[PDB]
Amino acid sequence: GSSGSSGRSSRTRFTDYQLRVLQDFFDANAYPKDDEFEQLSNLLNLPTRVIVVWFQNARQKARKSGPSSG
């Protein structure tokens, strides 16, 4: 099969302007539907596919366990 070349191989970098809306929309909602995703894609002018991958991960990083409190 494939030796490696694993990861994202997307080469997509967002700017504060975009990260602001993307991160802002996540802090409020991280489980939006296609209809919603479009709102961001139309504003940032980015493909939902790109916003999805970003939102998906953001969730994984958010999940944490341990002696953490707050």
Into which CATH architecture does domain 14-68 fall?
Orthogonal Bundle (1.10)
Residue 44 backbone zone (phi > 0: left; psi -120 to 50: alpha; other: beta): alpha
User: Which three-class secondary structure state does DSSP give residue 11?
Assistant: coil
Q: Which of 28, 4, 18 is nearest to 54 (CA)?
A: 18
In degrees, rounded to 5, the angle at the alpha carbon of residue 62 between the alpha carbons of residues 4 and 9 is 25
Domain ranges in the chain? 14-68
Residues 6+ apart with CB under 8 A from 55: 22, 26, 30, 32
Asked whether 20 and 27 are in contact (CB, 8 A), the reply is no
Asked whether 46 and 24 are in contact (CB, 8 A), the reply is no
4-42 residues labelled b (16+ CB within 10 A) or e (exposed)? eeeeeeeeeebeeebeebbeebbeeeeebeeeebeebbe
Residues 6+ apart with CB under 8 A from 51: 22, 37, 40, 41, 44
**Could you tell me the two tokens for 28?**
């409020």
